[PDB]
Design a binder for this molecule. Structure first.
Ligand code: HEM
Ligand code: HEM
Ligand SMILES: [Co+2]
Ligand SMILES: [Co+2]
Ligand SMILES: [O]
Ligand SMILES: [O]
Lengths: 153, 153
């Protein structure tokens, strides 16, 4: 896992990328295609390109390089924002509060019941099943952080 | 994982909680402590409450109810926002493009290389280490989806 300052280092350098995404995208695919030419074979519109000069001249490769870094940028920013909220929760529940995963199952059961009983119109079998799965994802994320810190519970 | 409609149910359902989070929180915690009393003994500020009467009467149990459901709401929203960008990318690259994990390593190395080259000033040893881990987490997320869909990456 990444520390708070590491995630901030990644967002910090990604700001520099987004400021000239067209050029960065170009260089990254040329770096890919020259270093590992088997990768060029997946791209119908590019596999004809033989040299760095032809690849730099390809408007298609330029535009796809931007499509790739735009998508990556968005996914890393989303990953970082999930971690900024998950990490301190996991940290405190592990080391200070000392809450076994089982107890998080208990509170998950409670959340489902209170929701069924207070908002049954908005909480059918399908929503109840959706909310059940979402709370399992939340506990598995805490659980994957508990193993990292070596918290036994 | 969950379908777009499932997440939308969870998010709809969450809306009805945010209308009265104080009350919802209070009942979840009271339902938790009555059902499983060992959970009350992790709260050094609530373990003096013996009855449901004392518990409904606690200003701070109620305020802690709001803290729990707020944080849980926040984290599930960020979880869903990450998935919504991971899923389509994993889908297309597994089923249509058929891109093995190995190739995602190559493009990861290329991004790191071009950032070392073009932006040393925002990309020293620590920042490079940070990005290396961040792209590892990205590949793992993709690899986890590859398993679900049956694609051998
Ligand atoms: C960080 C890594 C990557 C990102 C963020 C990324 C992102 C994308 C995006 C957004 C698309 C267009 C929408 C889509 O089809 O899903 C795309 C298309 C594609 N990607 Fe990737 N990709 C990555 C790595 C790779 C690698 C390593 C390869 C091949 C070696 C690859 C091959 C392709 C191909 C063939 C297409 C279709 C191109 C076309 O039809 O014009 N991707 N990629
Ligand atoms: C959905 C599940 C849970 C969420 C979202 C959650 C969230 C939080 C938050 C945001 C805090 C305050 C910040 C912090 O210290 O980390 C907190 C504190 C705490 N949580 Fe949790 N929690 C959950 C489940 C549990 C369970 C099951 C227990 C115990 C059985 C527990 C015990 C505590 C304790 C003891 C504190 C310290 C309270 C104090 O001294 O004032 N949590 N929780
Ligand atoms: Co999560
Ligand atoms: Co991710
Ligand atoms: O790509
Ligand atoms: O909590």
């Amino acid at each position: 896992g990444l520390s708070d300052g590491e995630w901030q280092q990644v967002l910090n350098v990604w700001g520099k990328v987004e400021a000239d995404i067209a050029g960065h995208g170009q260089e990254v695919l040329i770096r890919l295609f020259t270093g590992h030419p088997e990768t060029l074979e997946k791209f119908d519109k590019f596999k004809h390109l033989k040299t760095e000069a032809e690849m730099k001249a390809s408007e298609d490769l330029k535009k796809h390089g931007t499509v790739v870094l735009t998508a990556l940028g968005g996914i890393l920013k989303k990953h970082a924002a999930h971690e900024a909220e998950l990490k301190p929760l996991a940290q405190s529940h592990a080391t200070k509060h000392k809450i076994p995963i089982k107890y998080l199952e208990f509170i998950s059961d409670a959340i489902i019941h209170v929701l069924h009983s207070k908002h049954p119109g908005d909480f059918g079998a399908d929503a109840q099943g959706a909310m059940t799965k979402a709370l399992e994802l939340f506990r598995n994320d805490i659980a994957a952080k508990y193993k990292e810190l070596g918290f036994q519970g």
